[PDB]
């Protein structure tokens, strides 16, 4: 629902998945932020503090930007597939737009 406009995050962040690189649901992040390799996390979820904060450390032990998109919603499963129903996603190799050094 746009009228909360930073609902574009899925816009731009679906420009930039249609050819730049990204990860979708716990384990998938959780391994490749382990991995290091990430530059940006959404979490589309209003997510509690034990499960946040770790992704938030591995967002730390990466050099990842942290994005609550924790609108229960989750308008996000429009640019990766709306199936997971909750919207965990990272941005690594954005070879496309810009978005993970514009949110920096």
Same mark, same amino acid.
């Given at each position: 629902?746009?009228?909360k #406009? &930073?609902?574009?995050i %899925? &816009?731009?962040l679906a420009l930039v998945?249609? #050819?730049?690189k990204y990860? !979708?649901?716990?384990k998938?992040?959780?391994?490749?932020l382990?991995?290091?390799? #990430?530059? @940006?996390?959404?979490?589309?979820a %209003?997510?509690?503090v @034990?499960?946040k904060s770790? /992704?938030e $450390? $591995?967002?730390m !032990?990466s050099?990842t930007?942290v994005? $609550?998109? &924790?609108?229960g919603?989750?308008?996000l499963?429009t *640019?990766?597939?709306? @199936?997971?129903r909750?919207?965990?996603?990272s941005i /690594?190799? *954005?070879?496309? #737009?810009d978005?993970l050094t514009?949110?920096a």
């Amino acid at each position: 629902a746009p009228v909360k #406009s &930073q609902e574009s995050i %899925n &816009q731009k962040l679906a420009l930039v998945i249609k #050819s730049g690189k990204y990860t !979708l649901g716990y384990k998938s992040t959780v391994k490749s932020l382990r991995q290091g390799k #990430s530059k @940006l996390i959404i979490i589309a979820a %209003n997510t509690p503090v @034990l499960r946040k904060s770790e /992704l938030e $450390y $591995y967002a730390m !032990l990466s050099k990842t930007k942290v994005y $609550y998109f &924790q609108g229960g919603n989750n308008e996000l499963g429009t *640019a990766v597939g709306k @199936l997971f129903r909750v919207g965990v996603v990272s941005i /690594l190799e *954005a070879g496309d #737009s810009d978005i993970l050094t514009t949110l920096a």
